[PDB]
């Protein structure tokens, strides 16, 4: 047979010219059944068709073919466990995408791919089906239906071979969890291989930190329950004896700093081996070699062990490397935030010698802002220069605007509500604005604030606020009056060190008082101000306007933000009225908290707290009665009802109502011990303590000589005391703390409240 022509049928989409180019045979060629078979198998090999059929017609080589149907629609059903976009990402494999061509023969591959995907999610019993429907013009649509099954969970975590420690102590630090109480927050019983590897390396570190130089992990097995609901984890370990440290030595390309490195490497004899100390020593060697301008200092250490003496000798090798210089720093991805907003956070200077630790800590500084989802870094050698590089940062922004709401309860103030909206990166400028409000039983508050974190390039900040307040005293168990106020402040921040900073600013406040119940302590102040209200009536009012100068200082070296075990925190604040205002007074406060561990494991610690306050008028006038100090309650002295400590009211026509005083002193001492009866797997999440409290409040201006029939409220000798027990943990509803204490030294007007608690943020 000779090709007079080639005739096509069914080529509705695939080009006839493309097929004519694609066959191994052309017009005029001698053809047999072998060439016909080659043509049809080649057309099958093209992949555009599902059913190729060919024939030897009278005057042409006939090809009649149905092309592969084109998929025009993808739909899902029953997939609610996993996101539709996640399904779309998963189906990117195997050429399953809209607009392309496929066949029904590959459905099982999709089935098994989806099954494997949900197995990787942990849905070991999931099942999937597909339904396929064709359409004219050789179009086709498909739908996918999903059954999620049941997600497996970890049943037990077991360690065999340990003898030095109990298994619960080792389990307690792992990411995976086998027991989760309903009243605590410790995690979830999901299984992930990355978390398993992290737990394995944490277990290795836990033994390397205590002198077990010969520690090794033999094998690990993961087992599945026959119903495929539970997962079992078991690790095999073996540990030898503890080893002592005999000494260290260092050699290599030290580049002349050998004595300075050697003075850093010395360790006293008799200490146990410690991998954390070894790593810290080598990191300090890298840092010290890095401040001399080397870009990539490389160090390495291997331990030499002697099994006869149970001693380890440490060998360290150091390679200085070379010097590079930074030619340019570029940012990309910041399509909204200003360039300077990112460039401010860097620690590497452009046009200076490179520092790798500086680049990493600049990445961390940029990541701490929270404006970006992810941060990446790359160092690229500029072409044609042996020793110049460019540093490039990759960022992806996120929406910083949010609105938040909260609720809590406690004996101190009852039900509390919180609500507000905030925007941290206004127009990509770095400014922060927000509006906030709060309501308690006895107080209602609202404010609006604006803050510029960089008023000066060194970190000096500038901000202000505008507020409104509404305080009603009788609902707080005080003497009856009502105070509504508004004003505005402006303040500066000035950091001078990593741990402490200064503060200063100005402010204005306007006060309005009403419904004042007549009493001698209040009307002393009114007479001092020069007003003579009517003793028999309750319907008096008073107005004042003041300008104040504020300052402060804070010191904070605490070990960690939650459940600290070491450090101290001190805060001092002041206030004074500049001339031209109505009142003339000053006030100063100071409080202190410090932790002193008594155990090497930092599970037995001692806590001590204090609080002081003082204030008086400048001349002639007195401090207003609404600026007084208060004591008692869960915040100040446990065991006493809120605001009950101090002087008491004396009406004009004595009672348990407290009025507070213009001087205060409070002290406390507390012992923290491990919880006795919680299982060790999560015993560290609950803190239990015993305390001893004391404090007093007195009014320095009380003229005792004219009021012999009443106690002396100017005497600071009336010290109150109490002692008890308290405990706290993180509830699913939020932070939670309980207390029970009994006062063993009280006076006539003090009302006790033995059981106190608080739930959530208040």
């Amino acid at each position: 047979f000779v090709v007079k022509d080639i005739h096509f049928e069914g080529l509705q989409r695939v080009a006839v010219g493309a097929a004519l180019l694609s066959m191994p045979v052309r017009t005029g060629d001698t053809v047999n059944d072998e060439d016909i078979s080659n043509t049809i198998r080649a057309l099958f090999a093209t992949g555009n068709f599902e059913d190729v059929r060919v024939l030897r017609d009278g005057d042409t080589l006939l090809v009649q073919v149905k092309e592969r149907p084109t998929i025009a629609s993808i739909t899902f059903s029953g997939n609610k466990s996993v996101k539709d976009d996640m399904l779309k990402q998963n189906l990117e494999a195997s050429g399953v995408r809209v607009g392309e061509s496929l066949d029904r023969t590959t459905i099982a591959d999709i089935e098994k791919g989806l099954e494997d995907f949900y197995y990787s999610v942990g849905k070991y019993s999931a099942s999937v089906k597909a339904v396929v429907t064709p359409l004219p013009r050789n179009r086709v649509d498909l739908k996918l239906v999903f059954q999620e099954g049941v997600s497996a969970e970890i049943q037990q975590i077991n360690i065999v071979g340990n003898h030095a420690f109990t298994t619960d102590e080792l389990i307690s630090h792992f990411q995976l969890r086998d027991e989760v109480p309903w009243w605590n927050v410790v995690g979830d019983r999901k299984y992930q291989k990355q978390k398993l590897a992290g737990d394995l390396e944490t277990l290795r570190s836990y033994y390397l930190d205590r002198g077990y130089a010969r520690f090794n992990i033999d094998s690990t097995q993961v087992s599945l329950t026959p119903d495929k609901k539970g997962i079992y984890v078991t690790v095999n370990i073996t540990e030898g004896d503890q080893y002592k440290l005999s000494g260290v030595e260092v050699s290599g390309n030290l580049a002349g700093h050998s004595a300075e490195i050697e003075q850093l490497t010395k360790i006293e004899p008799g200490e146990l081996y410690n991998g954390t100390k070894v790593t810290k020593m080598e990191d300090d060697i890298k840092k010290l070699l890095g401040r001399y301008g080397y870009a990539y200092p490389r160090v390495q250490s291997m331990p030499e062990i002697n099994d006869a003496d149970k001693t380890v000798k440490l060998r360290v090798n150091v390679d200085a490397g070379n010097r590079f210089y930074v030619r340019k720093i570029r940012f990309e991805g910041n399509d909204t935030s200003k360039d300077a907003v990112l460039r401010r956070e860097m620690r590497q200077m452009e046009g200076a010698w490179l520092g790798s630790d500086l680049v990493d800590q600049g990445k961390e500084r940029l990541n701490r802002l929270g404006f970006f989802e992810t941060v990446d870094t790359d160092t690229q050698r500029v072409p044609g220069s042996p020793d110049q590089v460019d540093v490039v940062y990759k960022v992806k922004e996120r929406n910083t605007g949010s609105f938040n709401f909260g609720i809590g309860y406690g004996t101190e103030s009852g039900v509390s509500f919180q609500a507000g909206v905030q925007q941290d990166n206004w127009l990509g400028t770095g400014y922060a604005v927000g509006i906030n409000g709060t309501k308690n039983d006895y107080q209602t508050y609202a404010e609006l604030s604006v803050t510029n974190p960089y008023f000066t390039v060194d970190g000096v900040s500038l901000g202000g606020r505008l507020f409104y307040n509404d305080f009603q005293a009788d609902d707080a168990d005080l003497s009856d009056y009502t105070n509504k106020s508004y004003g505005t402040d402006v303040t500066l921040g000035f950091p001078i060190n990593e741990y402490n900073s200064l503060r200063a600013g100005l402010g204005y406040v306007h006060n309005s008082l009403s419904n004042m119940q007549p009493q001698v302590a209040m009307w002393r102040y009114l007479y001092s101000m020069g007003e003579h209200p009517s003793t028999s009536d309750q319907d008096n009012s008073f107005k004042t306007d003041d300008f104040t100068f504020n300052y402060g200082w804070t010191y904070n070296k605490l070990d960690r933000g939650y459940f600290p075990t070491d450090g101290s925190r001190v805060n001092l604040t002041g206030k004074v009225t500049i001339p031209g205002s109505d009142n003339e007074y000053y006030k100063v406060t100071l409080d202190t908290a410090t932790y002193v561990p008594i155990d090497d494991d930092h599970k037995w610690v001692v806590l001590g707290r204090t609080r002081w306050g003082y204030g008086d008028g400048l001349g002639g006038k007195e401090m207003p009665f609404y600026e007084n100090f208060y004591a008692g309650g869960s915040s100040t002295v446990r065991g006493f009802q809120s605001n009950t400590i101090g002087p008491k009211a004396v009406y004009f026509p004595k009672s348990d109502d407290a009025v507070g005083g213009n001087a205060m002193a409070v002290a406390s001492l507390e012992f923290i011990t491990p919880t006795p009866f919680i299982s060790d797997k999560y015993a560290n999440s609950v803190r239990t303590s015993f305390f001893w409290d004391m404090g007093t409040v007195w009014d320095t201006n009380w003229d005792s000589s004219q009021y012999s029939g009443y106690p002396d409220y100017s005497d600071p000798s009336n010290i109150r005391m109490s002692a008890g027990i308290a405990l706290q943990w993180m509830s699913p509803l939020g932070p939670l703390v309980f207390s029970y204490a009994q006062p063993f030294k009280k006076y006539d007007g003090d009302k006790a409240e033995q059981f106190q608690f608080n739930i959530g943020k208040t």
Binding site: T411, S413, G414, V415, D441, Y442
Partner: peptide, 13 residues
């Protein structure tokens, strides 16, 4: 005892 606000506490002795 009385329900002063939402807190429950002694207004008595």
């Amino acid at each position: 005892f009385a329900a002063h606000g939402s807190r429950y506490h002694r207004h008595c002795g």
